[PDB]
């Protein structure tokens, strides 16, 4: 599956990992993603409300399954069946952000 692995505790919340498939779905490279926020595969027709929902989760720390249009590096438009999962790993804090990728 395509995953990747945020630390919330970065500033911008950056990419710590990312699953090869990832790297394959979105065509960019990992040298390129690691440590920048995931906000780069947004492009001009990707709509704001539902980017809203997705900052919400991340603000208010809950989970989300929002279905999103990103784009790969190539500039090819795909739909994206977002998962949100927090690692709560802690003991009460959070640690990290698990997104999931899906092309729909
Ligand atoms: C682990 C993780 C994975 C994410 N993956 C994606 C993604 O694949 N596509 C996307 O459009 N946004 C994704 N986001 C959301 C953006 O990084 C960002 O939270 C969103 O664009 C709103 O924040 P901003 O207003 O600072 O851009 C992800 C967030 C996290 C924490």
């Given at each position: 599956?395509?995953?990747?692995?945020?630390?919330?505790?970065?500033?911008?919340?950056?990419?710590?990992?990312?699953?090869?498939?990832?790297?394959?779905?979105?065509?960019?490279?990992?040298?390129?993603?690691?440590?920048?926020?995931?906000?780069?595969?947004?492009?001009?027709?990707?709509?704001?409300?539902?980017?809203?929902?997705?900052?919400?989760?991340?603000?208010?720390?809950?989970?989300?399954?929002?279905?999103?249009?990103?784009?790969?590096?190539?500039?090819?438009?795909?739909?994206?069946?977002?998962?949100?999962?927090?690692?709560?790993d802690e003991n009460?804090?959070?640690?990290?952000?698990?997104?999931?990728?899906?092309?729909?």
């Open positions: 599956k395509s995953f990747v692995i945020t630390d919330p505790r970065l500033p911008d919340n950056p990419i710590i990992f990312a699953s090869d498939r990832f790297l394959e779905l979105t065509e960019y490279t990992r040298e390129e993603v690691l440590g920048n926020n995931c906000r780069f595969l947004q492009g001009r027709g990707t709509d704001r409300k539902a980017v809203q929902l997705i900052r919400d989760a991340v603000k208010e720390q809950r989970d989300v399954t929002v279905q999103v249009l990103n784009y790969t590096k190539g500039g090819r438009a795909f739909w994206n069946l977002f998962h949100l999962q927090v690692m709560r009460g804090d959070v640690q990290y952000f698990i997104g999931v990728q899906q092309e729909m």
